[PDB]
Ligand binder design. Structure first.
Ligand SMILES: CCCCCCCCCCCCCCCCCC(=O)OC[C@H](CO[C@@H]1O[C@H](CO[C@H]2O[C@H](CO)[C@H](O)[C@H](O)[C@H]2O)[C@H](O)[C@H](O)[C@H]1O)OC(=O)CCCCCCCCCCCCCCCCC
Ligand code: CLA
Ligand code: CLA
Ligand code: CLA
Ligand code: CLA
Ligand code: CLA
Ligand SMILES: CC(C)=CCC/C(C)=C/CC/C(C)=C/CC/C(C)=C/CC/C(C)=C/CC/C(C)=C/CC/C(C)=C/CC/C(C)=C/CC/C(C)=C/CC1=CC(=O)C(C)=C(C)C1=O
Ligand SMILES: CCCCCCCCCCCCCCCCCC(=O)OC[C@H](CO[C@@H]1O[C@H](CO)[C@H](O)[C@H](O)[C@H]1O)OC(=O)CCCCCCCCCCCCCCCCC
Ligand code: HEM
Ligand SMILES: CC1=C(/C=C/C(C)=C/C=C/C(C)=C/C=C/C=C(C)/C=C/C=C(C)/C=C/C2=C(C)CCCC2(C)C)C(C)(C)CCC1
Ligand SMILES: CC1=C(/C=C/C(C)=C/C=C/C(C)=C/C=C/C=C(C)/C=C/C=C(C)/C=C/C2=C(C)CCCC2(C)C)C(C)(C)CCC1
Ligand code: OEX
Lengths: 334, 136, 37, 52, 28, 35, 59, 75, 34, 151, 451
């Protein structure tokens, strides 16, 4: 009957079109801040001196980019890991020159996507569900925090964060391979098994349900009209799908339990993305992937090359050409 | 395939030549990688890349360092590239072994094996030793 | 190096940190010996 | 000055005033429901369903 | 009889694993 | 600059205190089983 | 002498690693055999003190 | 016949205590006698480079590839 | 008749031993950069 | 037929890529199995008795007093950073050289008195206490000559 | 087998320690046996590190993590990072290894033989999870022990030998901390500052007087907070906000220990005061400033006037200016301009690096210190090949800072996943729908159409 209790009843109401909740009190202002700043910076933002060497990189559509080449460029290397809000910048043009919008978007996005995760817990609690959908969303949240926050922290600069652009993402990937050999890191290998396996199991589970649908339609209408929303009966023969996949490989290698099967669909990509998020987070502190350069040696002592050595020649080509004016000394220790 | 011919290295300034035993070769690589390899990996110098360990750069030092005896003399007494002032206080040496505790347990046989590894490595990997990242 | 009275036991000390990994494996042997019931 | 070691970034006392006034404002609303609440009323569950 | 379907995999596997185990003690 | 800092500090402490006192507002009891 | 005593402490500990949990997890053996196991516990604890005495004396 | 009742029977372990170590030894002898280098043409650690050829041997002809390889593997 | 956990014990001890030899062989012999 | 070495026991063992030959490849005894170095006995080229090592420590002790005496010239000015930098720029080698020359039991207690006064000079320089730096700097000097007057 | 199968507990074998939630005596034995494991590893690992120790290499080149914690405490350590004895490191491991047999016995006593519930016959040690007064007593008792342990470090640093101070005048050495900083504006100025660059929330403690004065305050707070939680009962706002169950208390600790794990990782990566670089190797920031210092000294000997030497871009090749105005090292290392290593602070004035002190008084120990820090940068592979990812296999090195930071960043993330698992579950188990949705009264069905 009080004013706060009527506000609490509206915030936690499951009858709103979108659930707000108390995490939405952090989710909606931070993500709409980051969305507003991203759209304005992607369309029209002046070039950013990313490498701190007064060589400004254009990233917006009004400075000659397209959708692929356009980016919100990371902060200046001269800033480093320093906090650069607008009020610490003496003019907005100085803030725009030094890659200020990147720090505003990334910090509001990472706060807002952690609050999106807690909002996913919160609605499940108000709906009487089991809680752990937001644990599955923690795997892309850990990945976003690794490339936007954790890898800047270990390298000591927001300039080494992943650019908010399509071609900036590929620039982030190639320099990471030259400096950390992520392909030879087993945590990226588990991540590739997470997304190759996850899209395998998605196409596998989606095939066997669609293969074993029960006749409820004619040849003229769509097959999806055989399902009614809110029906209690099963819409596909799971015995027929188990008998198919049990004959495709062999019988003992197939889930007859649909609850164990859907748990395996949740676990395989999420654990795979968790591990590759802890690959980026541990290559942030330069615990790099496997180095097998000049490891095969013949009897005289000469180096016999392997495929890791040919991979090393491609790593050498990226690292001698990346940030080509930024280096003054023979080791890229940053 | 490590015959006596590849293991035959110049031992002194007069041009005399000796064969490294297989114990000298194996122990010399181990001791060089532990003691010297952090700065001298692959024959380059990380902290002063003008002065490498390739045999051309060793040929042009003013005490000519293309020998086992001249390399051992550098480890006991290091100088500049023209040999005019001592750099023992900034290079690991027997002369500054109170400064560098890594040089404190090193015999003259160990320095012979380390100088053996510097001399043998260009005979095995010609342009890779002291060549840097171009020949990686 | 260990003190001189204890360098005989230096190979035993080389396996001692691995023993916590053997305790996690022991819980799976004990669950398998009881039949996971 | 951003690399200087200020408590909560408070370099002017304007910012300290709006931190107090902002936090006390929702506190005063929250005390409209949870002020006048008895301190000695306990429960022996994992969760309490006391009042509004 | 299901012998030569599992033994087509198991017999070369143990032969290959005996070879790869011997390869760990080959030195240059 | 420092007028914007007052506005952002006022905005952040508004939404953070809504988050804080909202989760202090007997939030475990807001479940569909009871209350 | 220290090397002899530590080698005895290792052997007593290896005997107690494989007999103490067997005595505790068969459901009657600990109360019928704990005078024997406390005796081995005291030889174990006394060995540590004699080693600590011999280590400190030799230092 | 079920699977797990086979590998727990002692008749299975009478047969496979002889056949499995004999295949493991025969795989070991395939390497120890140096037969696997001669079957597949893999270089031993001695013979990546020879006294005449100090370079990496590549095949540069398609139809005399068998005869070019015989000249590169004579030493 | 053998207990099934006893087979998985010595079977897993064989897999541990063989993978320990494969990881030892990465530090010794061929492919060890030595 | 390839070269074999089961760890050191079966086969060659003294080959260039055997990794688990702990000391069996070389003739001279190692410091430990886990080492590549021989011990700190004789046949080592480093002689800790040598005159150029002692003279390097004595030259540190002599120049320390020269750096310790230009402290109050920073304290009639107020360059407190120059006091803290002087105690750490050249004088970083002082504790290494003083404890190396302190052999007897009265040398060690006469050395820590110099160390306590050196930390009083530093702590008063962070606190910017002008009289307390100079009152500690003369105690640091007077304890330095007492250490060098022994030997 | 009552309480030890799925038919009596409802938990499978893989969630099998969840059968211990409501049996307090067995749950006690699980915790002291796991305590015995951590004390075992502390004993066994540092005996491994003592056994594999060689005097020729620094302790960060030998792959050690535990004897550098004891050397920071002041055992066996000399001036400048000289390790002298390793007999105190051997002793610490023997005490920790012998004590794990006592904790390991009491673990398997209370787990296999002791009473399964303590509530009936040991009422001081028995507890219900819903007893809010008893649970604050256990929290308060263990808070006073954390305050007593924080005072042990204060006693060690002020009275019993002192601690290694890498900032000490005369060189880094063991030093009695005589005047710890007790000013709460300084001490809590670490707790309430920004986490970002230049500020560096709690990692940026830069002298041992702030370390030991912080552990006095932590010892004061934990003891006054322990007596507070022993004496009192949770307030009405606390009772409305928390879930009072055993899994809920686990998830509160999982969130707290994940925040500490992220913090200890960045301690290892950034701090060189409590983690001295003579023991742990240079930090990430420290090693790249050591490179810019090395080639400044290399080129000034060749006669370059290094303050006027223009780089390729037009900035300073060796000396440039920070965005706040301080004279810093040039190149890509301009991001690490907040680095305050002890071998570069002798060349700093108030304006940053002093130009005449760089021109005139650069000492040979500084050129040595920057040389090994340049060549032992925290960059390495998983198979411990030192250097960048394009380096060849000759150097066997990965920094202990890189091992400590990466492992504890791995662990702190997964313990935050454990917070999300166990707090979601405890909130749903308290409300009573953790086993699924009731078919009889589904909550969404008794709601308005949602549009
Ligand atoms: C939160 C979850 C939600 C995510 C949303 C993120 C947006 C929230 C707002 C940003 C919060 C980011 C924190 C950044 C922490 C930081 O830059 O961390 C770095 C600081 C260390 O700061 C460094 O501290 C250094 C201190 O060293 C100084 O002092 C030393 C003392 O010897 C040395 O002298 C050294 O030379 C000298 O420079 C310097 O000041 C550096 O400039 C400064 O960067 O650590 C710290 O603050 C201490 C550790 C804080 C915990 C670390 C958390 C990291 C986040 C992991 C989350 C991944 C999981 C996400 C899942 C969701
Ligand atoms: C049985 C009890 C006992 C214990 C615990 C010790 C222990 C020790 N004695 Mg010995 N001593 C003993 C009996 C014992 N001794 C006997 C019977 C004699 C003959 C009279 C001696 C004669 C003797 C001499 C002459 C000397 C010693 C020394 C030592 C120390 C060796 C290392 C060192 O140099 O100290 C440096 C200090 C340390 C290494 C600190 C070690 C303790 C740390 C903090 C680890 C403890 C952690 C914690 C308790 C473990 C967790 C436990 C669990 C609750 C989880 C060590 C602390 C030496 C010494 O005391 O030097 C000052 C020494 O010179 N002893
Ligand atoms: C940190 C590791 C750890 C610890 C301390 C425990 C502890 C416990 N578990 Mg758990 N568990 C663990 C990990 C652990 N678990 C893991 C990884 C799994 C998945 C495999 C499980 C799965 C599991 C299930 C399914 C169950 C338990 C149960 C238990 C409890 C009773 C065990 C029992 O009575 O059976 C008797 C056990 C044995 C007879 C095996 C003997 C093993 C001994 C202790 C080995 C000692 C060796 C050591 C070297 C001896 C040193 C002696 C010296 C110090 C004197 C006990 C508190 C049970 C429970 O919850 O009861 C209510 C139960 O049902 N656990
Ligand atoms: C101190 C911290 C702590 C404690 C006391 C608990 C306690 C519990 N957990 Mg929780 N949990 C934790 C942290 C903790 N957890 C963390 C950090 C995570 C995220 C990974 C989880 C995620 C989690 C899930 C998903 C579940 C639990 C469950 C449980 C309950 C039963 C556990 C069991 O029997 O497993 C027995 C142990 C095993 C089966 C072995 C685990 C397999 C590991 C991963 C293999 C080891 C790999 C490698 C060698 C070590 C990891 C890598 C290394 C580098 C660190 C028990 C109450 C269960 C539950 O909810 O019950 C109600 C459950 O389903 N926990
Ligand atoms: C730390 C966790 C812990 C807790 C809460 C308990 C609690 C209990 N134990 Mg268990 N136990 C433990 C660890 C623990 N124990 C350990 C480590 C061992 C091996 C020594 C045992 C071996 C053991 C046996 C054999 C028995 C018990 C018994 C009991 C129960 C009766 C208490 C008592 O005897 O009177 C109170 C005891 C005292 C007032 C004497 C205290 C003396 C100790 C040594 C002081 C410790 C010093 C200091 C506080 C801690 C230093 C180490 C620390 C820094 C880690 C009680 C539930 C009894 C039982 O369960 O009966 C069925 C019983 O017979 N315990
Ligand atoms: C292991 C450490 C630990 C843990 C797990 C706890 C756990 C708890 N503490 Mg305790 N506490 C601790 C250490 C710990 N404490 C220490 C070391 C101290 C001494 C500083 C205290 C002093 C203390 C007090 C005074 C109170 C608690 C309370 C609580 C309970 C709920 C509050 C909470 O945690 O929300 C976390 C909430 C925050 C971090 C923000 C709280 C802001 C407060 C409510 C503002 C109110 C103004 C008031 C005048 C305080 C002045 C400071 C203010 C300006 C921030 C919870 C059981 C509350 C309780 O119920 O006591 C019985 C309570 O009133 N603790
Ligand atoms: C006589 C002479 C001369 C002698 C010569 C000797 C001789 C002839 C030798 C030849 C022997 C020879 C080689 C024959 C053997 C044949 C053989 C096997 C060759 C193939 C070679 C080869 C190595 C094959 C291996 C490839 C293989 C089988 C891989 C599959 C691995 C495997 C276990 C996959 C399972 C993956 C998995 C768990 C997916 C399920 C997840 C998923 C989403 C399922 C979806 C799903 C599942 C359900 O279940 C139900 C219900 C529903 C709803 C549903 O959504
Ligand atoms: C596990 C997950 C990982 C945990 C992350 C660890 C957090 C790191 C520790 C943070 C340090 C905390 C110190 C106080 C904060 C600080 O001083 O920042 C204050 C800093 C300082 O602010 C800057 O300071 C500079 C001076 O150095 C200048 O003055 C700048 O102008 C000023 O902006 O500003 C920020 O970082 C803003 C913080 C915004 C926080 C809002 C998000 C919080 C929402 C969470 C909901 C609240 C629930 C948690 C409540 C408990
Ligand atoms: C014990 C192992 C070492 C050996 C055998 C060794 C050998 C040599 C030799 C022979 C030279 C002269 C090259 C020439 O004249 O062309 C040299 C130069 C140099 N080495 Fe080493 N070195 C060792 C250790 C180190 C270490 C550990 C470092 C790293 C700190 C280092 C840094 C340098 C530098 C900077 C130079 C250049 C000196 C100059 O400018 O003249 N050396 N070294
Ligand atoms: C309950 C349970 C469990 C657990 C268990 C545990 C965890 C236990 C622990 C245990 C422990 C934790 C133990 C410990 C032990 C120890 C010992 C036994 C020790 C000994 C020692 C010694 C003998 C030493 C010696 C020496 C010296 C003195 C010197 C140097 C050298 C040496 C080292 C040799 C499990 C998981 C199974 C599951 C089921 C149930
Ligand atoms: C030792 C040392 C030191 C010190 C430190 C200190 C003094 C600390 C403190 C600490 C502190 C003082 C901390 C605090 C923390 C806090 C926290 C961490 C909080 C949290 C919170 C929470 C968790 C809550 C939640 C919630 C909400 C928000 C809403 C409602 C519901 C709840 C309640 C759940 C120094 C640095 C000087 C130096 C070095 C050493
Ligand atoms: O920022 Mn982005 O990439 Ca990491 O390395 Mn150094 O810094 Mn820059 O170069 Mn390479």
């Amino acid at each position: 009957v009080s004013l706060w209790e009527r506000f609490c009843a509206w915030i936690t109401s499951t009858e709103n079109r979108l659930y707000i909740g108390w995490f939405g009190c952090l989710m909606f202002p931070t993500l709409l801040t980051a969305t507003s700043c991203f759209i304005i910076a992607f369309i029209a933002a002046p070039p950013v001196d990313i490498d701190g060497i007064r060589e400004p990189v254009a990233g917006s559509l009004l400075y000659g980019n397209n959708i692929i080449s356009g980016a919100v460029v990371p902060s200046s290397n001269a800033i480093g890991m320093h906090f650069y809000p607008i009020w610490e910048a003496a003019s907005i043009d100085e803030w725009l020159y030094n890659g200020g919008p990147y720090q505003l978007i990334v910090l509001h996005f990472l706060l807002g996507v952690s609050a999106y995760m807690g909002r996913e817990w919160e609605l499940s609690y108000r709906l009487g569900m089991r809680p752990w959908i937001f644990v599955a969303f923690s795997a892309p949240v850990a990945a976003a925090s690794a490339v936007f926050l954790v890898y800047p922290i270990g390298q000591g600069s927001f300039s080494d964060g992943m650019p908010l652009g399509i071609s900036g993402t590929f620039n982030f990937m190639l320099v990471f391979q030259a400096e950390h050999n992520i392909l030879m890191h087993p945590f990226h290998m588990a991540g590739v098994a997470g997304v190759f396996g996850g899209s395998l199991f998605s196409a596998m589970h989606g095939s066997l349900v669609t293969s074993s649908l029960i006749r409820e339609t004619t040849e003229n209408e769509s097959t999806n009209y055989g399902y009614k929303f809110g029906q209690e009966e099963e819409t596909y023969n799971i015995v027929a799908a188990h008998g198919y996949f049990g004959r495709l490989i062999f019988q003992y290698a197939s889930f007859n339990n649909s609850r164990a099967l859907h748990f395996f669909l949740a676990l395989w990509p999420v654990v795979g993305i968790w591990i590759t998020s802890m690959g980026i987070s541990t290559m942030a502190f330069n615990l790099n992937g496997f180095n097998f350069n000049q490891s095969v040696v013949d009897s005289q002592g000469r180096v016999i090359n392997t495929w890791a050595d040919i991979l090393n020649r491609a790593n050498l080509g990226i690292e001698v050409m990346h940030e080509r004016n930024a280096h003054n000394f023979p080791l890229d220790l940053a | 395939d490590l015959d006596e011919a590849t293991r035959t290295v110049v031992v002194d300034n007069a041009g005399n030549t000796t064969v490294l035993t297989p114990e000298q070769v194996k122990r010399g690589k181990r001791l060089f990688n532990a003691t010297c390899g952090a700065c001298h990996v692959g024959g380059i110098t990380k902290t002063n890349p003008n002065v490498g360990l390739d045999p051309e750069a060793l040929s042009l030092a003013t005490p000519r360092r293309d020998n086992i005896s001249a390399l051992v003399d550098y480890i006991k007494n290091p100088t500049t590239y023209d040999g005019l002032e001592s750099i023992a206080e900034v290079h690991p040496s027997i002369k500054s072994a109170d400064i560098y505790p890594r040089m404190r347990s090193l015999t003259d046989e160990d320095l012979y094996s380390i100088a053996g590894h510097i001399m043998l490595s260009p005979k095995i990997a010609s342009e890779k030793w002291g060549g840097g990242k171009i020949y990686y | 190096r260990l003190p001189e009275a204890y360098v005989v036991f230096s190979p035993i000390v080389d396996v001692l940190p691995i023993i916590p990994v053997f305790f996690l494996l022991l819980a799976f042997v004990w669950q398998a010996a009881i039949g996971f019931r | 000055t951003e690399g200087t070691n200020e408590w909560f970034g408070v370099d002017d006392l304007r910012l300290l005033a709006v931190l107090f006034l902002g936090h006390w404002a929702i506190l005063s609303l929250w005390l409209g429901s949870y002020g006048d609440s008895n301190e000695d009323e306990d429960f022996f569950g994992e969760i309490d369903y006391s009042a509004r | 009889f299901r012998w030569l379907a599992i033994h087509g995999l198991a017999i070369p596997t143990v032969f290959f694993l005996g070879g790869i185990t011997a390869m760990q003690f080959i030195q240059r | 600059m420092l007028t914007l800092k007052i506005l952002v500090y006022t905005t952040v402490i508004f939404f953070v205190s809504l988050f804080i006192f909202g989760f202090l507002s007997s939030d475990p009891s807001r479940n569909p089983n009871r209350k | 002498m220290i090397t002899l005593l530590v080698a005895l402490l290792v052997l007593i500990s290896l005997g107690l690693v494989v007999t103490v949990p067997v005595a505790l997890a068969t459901p009657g053996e600990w109360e019928i055999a704990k005078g024997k196991f406390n005796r081995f516990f005291q030889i174990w604890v006394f060995l540590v003190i004699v080693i600590a005495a011999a280590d400190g004396i030799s230092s | 016949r079920p699977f797990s009742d086979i590998i727990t029977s002692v008749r299975y372990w009478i047969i496979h205590s002889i056949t499995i170590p004999s295949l493991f030894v025969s795989g070991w002898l395939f390497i120890s006698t140096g037969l696997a280098y001669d079957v597949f043409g893999t270089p031993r650690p001695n013979e990546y480079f020879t006294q005449d050829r100090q370079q990496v041997p590549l095949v540069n002809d398609r139809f005399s590839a068998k005869q070019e390889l015989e000249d590169l593997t004579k030493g | 008749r053998i207990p099934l956990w006893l087979v998985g014990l010595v079977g897993g001890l064989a897999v541990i031993t063989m993978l320990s030899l494969f990881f030892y062989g990465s530090y010794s012999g061929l492919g060890s950069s030595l | 037929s390839p070269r074999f070495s089961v760890f050191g026991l079966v086969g060659d063992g003294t080959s260039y890529s055997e990794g688990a030959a702990y000391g069996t490849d070389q003739a001279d005894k190692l410091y430990s199995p886990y080492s590549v170095y021989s011990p700190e006995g004789e046949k080592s080229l480093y002689k800790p008795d040598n005159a150029e090592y002692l003279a390097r420590k004595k030259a540190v002790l002599a120049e320390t007093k020269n750096r310790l005496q230009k402290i109050p010239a920073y304290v009639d000015k107020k360059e407190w950073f120059n006091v803290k930098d002087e105690l750490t720029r050249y004088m970083y080698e002082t504790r290494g050289a003083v404890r190396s020359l302190s052999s007897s039991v009265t040398q060690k207690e006469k050395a820590e008195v110099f160390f306590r006064a050196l930390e009083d000079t530093y702590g008063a320089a962070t606190l910017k206490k002008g009289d307390a730096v100079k009152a500690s700097n003369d105690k640091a000097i007077a304890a330095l000559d007492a250490f060098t007057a022994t030997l | 087998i009552a309480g030890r199968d799925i038919e009596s507990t409802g938990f499978a074998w893989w969630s099998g320690n969840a059968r211990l939630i409501n049996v307090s005596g067995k749950l006690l034995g699980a915790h002291v046996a796991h305590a015995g494991l951590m004390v075992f590893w502390a004993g066994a690992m540092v005996l491994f590190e003592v056994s594999h120790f060689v005097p020729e290499k620094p302790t960060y080149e030998q792959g050690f993590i535990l004897i550098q914690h004891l050397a920071t405490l002041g055992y066996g350590i000399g001036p400048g990072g000289e390790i002298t004895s390793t007999v105190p490191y051997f002793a610490v491991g023997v005490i920790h290894l012998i004590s794990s047999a006592i904790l390991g016995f009491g673990g398997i006593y209370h787990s296999l033989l002791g009473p399964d519930t303590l509530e009936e016959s040991f009422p001081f040690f028995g507890y219900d999870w819903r007893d809010k007064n008893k649970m604050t007593t256990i929290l308060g008792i263990h808070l006073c022990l954390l305050g007593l342990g924080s005072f042990l470090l204060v006693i060690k640093a002020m009275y019993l030998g002192g601690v290694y101070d890498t900032w000490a005048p005369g060189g880094g050495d063991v030093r009695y901390i005589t005047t710890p900083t007790l000013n709460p504006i300084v001490i809590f100025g670490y707790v309430f500052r920004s986490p970002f660059g230049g500020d560096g929330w709690v990692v940026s403690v830069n002298n041992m007087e702030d370390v030991i004065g912080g552990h006095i305050w932590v010892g004061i707070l934990c003891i006054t907070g322990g007596i507070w939680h022993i004496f009192t009962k949770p307030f009405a706002w606390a009772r409305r906000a928390f879930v009072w169950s055993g899994e809920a208390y686990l998830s509160y600790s999982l969130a707290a220990i994940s925040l500490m794990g992220f913090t200890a990782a960045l301690y290892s990566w950034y701090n060189n005061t409590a983690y001295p670089s003579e023991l742990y190797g240079p930090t990430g920031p420290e090693a790249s400033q050591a490179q810019a210092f090395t080639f400044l000294v290399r080129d000034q000997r060749l006669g370059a006037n290094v303050s006027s030497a223009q780089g390729p871009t037009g900035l300073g090749k060796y000396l440039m200016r920070s965005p706040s105005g301080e004279i810093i090292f040039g190149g890509e290392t301009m991001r690490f301009w907040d680095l305050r290593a002890p071998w570069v602070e002798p060349l700093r004035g108030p304006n940053g690096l002093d130009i005449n002190k760089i021109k005139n008084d650069i000492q040979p120990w500084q050129e040595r210190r920057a040389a090994e820090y340049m060549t032992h940068a925290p960059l390495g592979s998983l198979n411990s090949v030192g250097g960048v990812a394009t380096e060849i296999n000759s150097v066997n090195y990965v920094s202990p800072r890189s091992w400590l930071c990466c492992s504890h960043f791995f662990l702190a993330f997964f313990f935050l996943v454990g917070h999300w698992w166990h707090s979601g579950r405890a909130r749903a188990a308290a409300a009573g729908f953790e086993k699924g949705i009731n078919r009889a009264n589904e909550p969404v069905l008794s709601m308005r159409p949602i549009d």
